[PDB]
Design a binder for this molecule. Structure first.
Ligand SMILES: Nc1ncnc2c1ncn2[C@@H]1O[C@H](COP(=O)(O)OP(=O)(O)OP(=O)(O)O)[C@@H](O)[C@H]1O
Ligand SMILES: [Mg+2]
Ligand SMILES: [Mg+2]
Ligand SMILES: [Mg+2]
Lengths: 207, 297, 753
């Protein structure tokens, strides 16, 4: 009844999520990225991926024409319609550490930018911390198969959300060249119970 | 007896009253609510409720374990009556959890108050800073209080006489999470049943002092006798009902005041599964059964 | 005989000490003081004068035959003996011609003998003044005759507008506190002169009141036989007093565990509410027991000690008071707030430590308080708590409770009254406790922070109106009660104050300081030989007045951008601009070390948060940092932590106060004086220095080489000598260097402020 959607997020152009507005993070860089609390490794929070995926899916499923297919996946508690959820996101830790040390490189970088005034032609630099491209994040998303007739449509929408992410960014200054990601090794396996239509769900994810 | 060891591979959010704060443990009513929600999901809430109410399954609340050291909240003992020397309950105030095996050392003194604190090192708290992105309005920020466990650290629950239904709900509870923002990336653990014989020695022993090991509320017919040479602390349990088919709107459950899970009693009591939601479509239960560890005082 | 006469005579018993060492008459101080009180017509009923004139053995013996029994001055004499302790009890009286009395000695500090088993004994004293707080100095200093003459003229001014009535006892006590606080009660060497006249007289009045009430309950009308005719051994043995232990629980959760958007504004309001709650409860119980304010040995910090009479009437009143207080607290704050009321029976020998266990008083009082806090509610209050549960769709915005809500707003009644009083909490405001007000109070009263003018048209024609003020001018008339609490607010907005600094990071600073081992100092800090109720009261008053009054005055000395939430006792909670908080941390440490002359140490935790950070998490995190500073232990071989440390923004940056000041601040000063002419590439170079220094632990060689290269790149706008200095620091004192560099980056960050 519970499916585990596995996969990997590969950074393509450098990704900047979040603000760690505590003294330790801000004392070493102007705008830090979210790190693990203990290991201090970069992570993709489940909320960030979930929110961006939901935003793209809500755009695409309406397209100027939320709806039930979004509320059943991500939940709702607004005023009278309360669907709990079917997708259970998890905080995505950095999986490429031993691979990144073979390159003698740190997992994070500082990108030096600036803005140039248009009235006075005066520039002003800024630094943003960013998770370097080539970093990998293995994620697990748990699906609660509440309905047997809607699982195929839910997984079609999940694949659509992943595809929309692949042609978008994930966190931070995306339109200025950051946060481009790719999805690889996408698969779904039944963790609890028996589900004979897991093969077609893998076909949807492997599409 | 059948210690349910929880290994968390994500930061947890166990809220007391606010989303910006997290506590390192979760209570027995929280675990019971999680398992009852799982049972509703897989359609045998009545069987689980009958198991819990008939004492077929009764569990303590989550306690820290650090490298095969099982901890217990510092019991509220009527001792410190050693009125000559030492620092009884003076340096034993920042000490929140004592090892379950070292409880006899703590009873008669000699436990190092300082050393028991830096030895107790389970993860650390953090605040996750988030927003609700609005496409044309101003994005509204919000933050979640989280706790991240360490490598060889987690939580454990004392269950005696485990059940197939409890094991089946625990397997499903792996992939739904426990705690506050579990549908976000916060509720994620692995569990083991891990029968233990050292702990069974402690719980097979009798004594004149009963350490309450779960948030419990004695029934009205036994509260008076429970309150007799008792050294307890009263805790409020409540919050919003978490269900889809209740009241069609968010409603808080009734506040239940129970004995905190470090309290010590001389008279044993068995609590109850209290119904803290009665105006909705389904009952809402608050697990307040008593889990006791007996010692000599 | 009237009890008020005994109270006034015991308060003014040593009036003649200041009278005698202020003028030139050469007579016994009791006689001179009796004549001085005789100079006022309202203070003339022969009972006042009998208590003032005859409170010593020789004077009583000279007139005991002529005076009748139960004459109220035996009580004052025995109360003076009890308050003295192991000090002089029956010897020559000041002003007599059998000795040469030095009328010019200053009072010593109580910290001269505090912790002397490990820190030694020393001879400090207070220089005379004329607030402001008087600090102790090692230099020997004298009290000129002009000092006591000015004291005498101010006392003549105040005493003309005073009466021996019930409502003027507070005014008399305020006079004594203002004037006698810095005059010795004994100008005799070969002993300790550290007891003030105010503390000695207050203890004597409290003991005399308790003894009188005990005597009335026990039906004793032979004070001469029972006290003076013999050495009062039988009286000294019997338990005539009660030591009571008002103890408030859950103040941290009530004050700081809130989640409103405007939750920073209400912190001071909640702290003030709890402080005045405790003060009002103590005053109410005192007036229910017909006792004076002198019987409050200590109040503040969510704790109150009262000296009572071991009588059945007192115990019945205590039971009724406790029941009413418990019901009121349960009604308003279900379990969030609680006051524990425990008392123990003590004897005059216990108070004087003659039997050797004066400390057992507080030992068993603490035992009783812990026993009462372990079993707070009976098995009917819990039942009522569980039965008054309702399913609610609404809850308080910041107090998150579903009861006592307002019909048009999701906020609790306490939660709205606190916001109101926070809006009316400003400088030079007094507090009125009447039947009408804003904040709910126990026993059917309400409290407002309304101003002076609209308070004058509230007591001139009304019944049972109580006025509380921070400052009292013209002590005699306009009867108020002075309440002390740290409440210095530079600016209550908390937002314009942040947008007042121009250089630095836009961060709030939270300071939480706490004296290390103050309870241990109260237990065994004072040597057993110098143990008395007067010395204990002197130490308690020193600590409390320091925190409240002197923190206010010190923060007012220079315009620190601080918004003190609570000072109280032994603790401190202040929020302000993080640079001002960091600058004031060292000033606070130095001022405390001067005031105690290094007999007690203080631990602090400094947190740095943004404006919109949750106030509950600010409090919790800064408390964690303060606990980490209290965990400071440089070597893992000693017993108990050193505790004399400060935590800087994170539990890993725990440094001792000497280490912080010397190392970190000289490094920060050098960095500031050498880095001001760096370019904007130099800022990135400092960032890289910090990263390399942090990574040095896992990269021994390559990272130190990279640091050398970075210093090479930098040593064109900073100089070669400072590059070498930084390189030497990095290999010798790295964590201090990292701390200083991070502080410099945050202080010089050009991201507004
Ligand atoms: N009005 C106040 N405002 C702010 N802080 C206060 C106030 N009154 C007291 N405090 C401080 O709060 C600290 C803890 O008080 P609290 O009663 O919540 O815990 P506690 O001392 O451990 O007592 P208990 O064991 O009964 O809970 C004390 O150090 C006290 O100085
Ligand atoms: Mg207390
Ligand atoms: Mg302290
Ligand atoms: Mg304290």
């Amino acid at each position: 009844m519970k499916l585990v959607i596995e996969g990997t997020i590969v950074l393509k152009t450098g990704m900047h999520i979040g603000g760690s507005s505590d003294f330790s993070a801000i004392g070493a860089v102007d705008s830090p990225v979210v790190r693990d609390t203990l290991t201090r490794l970069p992570l993709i929070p489940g909320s960030s991926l979930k929110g961006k995926m939901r935003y793209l899916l809500a755009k695409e499923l309406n397209n100027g024409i939320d709806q039930d297919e979004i509320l059943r996946l991500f939940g709702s508690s607004e005023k009278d319609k309360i669907r709990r959820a079917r997708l259970k996101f998890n905080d995505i830790k950095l999986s490429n550490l031993a691979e990144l040390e073979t390159f003698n490189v740190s997992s994070t970088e500082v990108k030096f930018e600036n803005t140039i005034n248009r009235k006075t032609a005066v520039a002003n630099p800024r630094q943003i911390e960013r998770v370097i491209a080539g970093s990998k994040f293995d994620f697990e998303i748990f699906y609660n198969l509440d309905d047997i007739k809607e699982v195929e449509k839910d997984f079609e929408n999940i694949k659509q959300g992943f595809d929309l992410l692949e042609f978008d960014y994930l966190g931070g200054h995306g339109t200025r060249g950051s946060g481009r990601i790719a999805f690889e090794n996408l698969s779904v396996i039944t963790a609890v119970g028996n589900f004979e239509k897991i093969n077609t769900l893998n076909e949807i994810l492997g599409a | 007896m059948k210690i349910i060891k929880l290994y968390f591979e994500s930061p947890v959010h166990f809220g007391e009253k606010r989303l910006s704060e997290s506590k390192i443990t979760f209570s027995a009513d929280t675990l019971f609510s999680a398992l009852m929600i799982e049972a509703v999901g897989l359609g045998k809430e009545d069987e689980f409720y009958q198991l819990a109410s008939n004492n077929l399954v009764k569990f303590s609340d989550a306690f820290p374990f650090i490298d095969q050291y099982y901890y217990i909240p510092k019991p509220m003992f009527n001792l410190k009556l050693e009125k000559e020397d030492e620092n009884p309950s003076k340096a034993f105030k920042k000490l929140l959890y004592v090892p379950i095996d070292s409880l006899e050392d703590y009873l008669s003194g000699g436990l190092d108050a300082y050393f028991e604190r830096e030895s107790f090192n389970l993860g650390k708290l953090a605040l996750s800073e988030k927003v609700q992105q609005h496409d044309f309005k101003d994005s509204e920020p919000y933050n979640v209080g989280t706790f991240t466990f360490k490598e060889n650290t987690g939580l454990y629950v004392l269950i005696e006489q485990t059940h197939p239904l409890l094991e089946e709900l625990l397997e499903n509870l792996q992939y739904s999470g426990i705690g506050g923002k579990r549908n976000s990336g916060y509720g994620k653990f692995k569990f083991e049943i891990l029968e233990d014989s050292d702990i069974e020695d402690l719980f097979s022993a009798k004594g004149n002092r009963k350490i309450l090991l779960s948030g419990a509320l004695p029934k009205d017919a036994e509260l008076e006798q429970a309150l007799k040479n008792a050294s307890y602390l009263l805790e409020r349990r409540g919050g919003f009902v978490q269900s889809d088919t209740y009241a069609t709107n968010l409603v808080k459950k009734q506040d239940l005041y129970v004995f905190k899970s470090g309290s010590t009693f001389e008279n044993s009591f068995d609590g109850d599964i209290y119904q803290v939601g009665k105006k909705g479509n389904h009952p809402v239960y608050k697990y307040a059964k008593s889990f006791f560890l007996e010692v000599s005082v | 005989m009237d009890k008020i006469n005994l109270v006034c005579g015991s308060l003014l018993a040593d009036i003649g000490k200041i009278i005698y060492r202020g003028t030139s008459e050469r007579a016994k101080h009791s006689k001179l003081g009796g004549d001085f009180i005789k100079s006022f017509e309202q203070f003339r009923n022969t009972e006042l004068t009998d208590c003032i004139r005859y409170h010593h053995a020789q004077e009583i013996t000279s007139v005991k035959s002529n005076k009748e029994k139960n004459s109220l001055f035996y009580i004052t004499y025995i109360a003076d003996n009890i308050s003295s302790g192991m000090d002089r009890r029956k010897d020559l009286e000041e002003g007599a011609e059998g000795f040469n009395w030095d009328k010019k000695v200053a009072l010593g500090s109580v910290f001269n003998v505090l912790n002397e088993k490990e820190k030694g004994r020393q001879n400090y004293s207070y220089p005379f003044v004329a607030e402001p707080l008087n600090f102790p100095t090692a230099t020997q200093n004298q009290y000129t005759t002009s000092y006591y003459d000015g004291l005498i003229t101010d006392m003549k001014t105040i005493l003309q507008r005073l009466k021996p009535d019930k409502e003027h006892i507070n005014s008399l006590l305020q006079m004594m506190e203002s004037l006698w606080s810095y005059v010795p009660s004994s100008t005799d060497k070969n002993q300790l002169v550290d007891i003030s006249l105010y503390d000695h007289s207050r203890t004597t009045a409290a003991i005399a009141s308790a003894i009188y009430d005990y005597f009335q309950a026990e039906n004793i009308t032979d004070y001469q036989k029972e006290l003076f005719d013999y050495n009062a051994t039988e009286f000294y043995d019997k338990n005539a007093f009660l030591m009571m232990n008002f103890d408030m629980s859950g103040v941290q959760n009530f004050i700081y565990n809130i989640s409103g958007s405007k939750a920073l504004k209400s912190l001071r309001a909640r702290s003030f509410y709890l402080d005045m709650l405790l003060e009002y409860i103590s005053d109410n119980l005192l007036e229910k027991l017909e006792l004076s304010r002198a019987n409050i040995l200590y109040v503040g910090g969510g704790h109150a000690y009262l000296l009572l009479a071991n009588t059945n009437k007192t115990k019945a009143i205590l039971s009724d008071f406790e029941h009413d207080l418990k019901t009121w607290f349960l009604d308003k704050f279900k379990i969030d707030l609680y006051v524990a009321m425990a008392y123990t029976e003590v004897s005059a020998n216990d108070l004087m430590n003659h039997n050797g266990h004066y400390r057992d008083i507080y030992r068993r009082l603490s035992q009783k308080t812990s026993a009462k806090k372990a079993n707070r509610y009976t098995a009917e209050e819990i039942l009522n708590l569980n039965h008054q549960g309702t399913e609610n769709a609404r809850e308080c915005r910041e107090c998150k409770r579903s009861d006592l809500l307002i019909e048009e707003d999701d906020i609790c009644e306490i939660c709205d009254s606190l916001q109101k009083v926070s809006r009316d909490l400003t400088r030079e405001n007094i507090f009125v406790i009447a039947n009408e007000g804003v904040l709910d109070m126990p026993f059917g009263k309400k409290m407002s922070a309304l101003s002076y003018s609209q308070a004058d048209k509230l007591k001139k024609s009304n019944a049972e109106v109580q006025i509380y003020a921070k400052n009292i001018s013209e002590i005699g008339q306009n009867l108020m009660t002075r309440i002390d609490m740290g409440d210095y607010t530079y600016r209550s907005d908390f937002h314009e104050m942040l947008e007042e600094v121009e250089v630095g990071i836009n961060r709030l600073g939270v300071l939480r300081a706490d004296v290390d081992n103050l309870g241990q100092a109260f237990i065994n800090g004072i040597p057993d030989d110098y143990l008395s109720i007067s010395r204990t009261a002197t130490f308690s008053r020193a600590m409390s007045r320091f925190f409240k009054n002197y923190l206010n005055q010190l923060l007012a000395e220079k315009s620190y951008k601080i918004n003190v939430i609570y000072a109280g006792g032994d603790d401190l909670f202040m929020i302000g601009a993080w640079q001002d908080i960091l600058d004031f941390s060292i000033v606070l440490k130095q001022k405390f070390a001067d005031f105690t002359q290094n007999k007690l140490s203080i631990s602090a935790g400094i947190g740095m948060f943004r404006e919109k950070y949750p106030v509950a998490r600010m409090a919790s995190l800064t408390g964690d940092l303060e606990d980490a500073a209290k965990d400071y232990k440089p070597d893992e071989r000693a017993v108990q932590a050193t505790k004399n440390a400060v935590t800087l923004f994170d539990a890993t940056n725990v440094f001792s106060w000497d280490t912080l000041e010397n190392d970190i601040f000289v490094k920060l000063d050098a960095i500031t004086k050498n880095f001001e002419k760096l370019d904007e590439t130099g800022k990135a170079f400092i960032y890289r220095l910090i990263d390399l220094l942090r990574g040095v632990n896992e990269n021994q060689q390559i990272n130190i080489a990279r640091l050398a290269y970075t210093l090479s790149r930098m040593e064109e706008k900073i100089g070669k000598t400072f590059a070498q200095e930084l390189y030497n620091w990095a290999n010798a004192d790295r964590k201090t260097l990292i701390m200083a560099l991070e502080i410099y980056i945050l202080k010089t960050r050009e991201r507004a402020a």
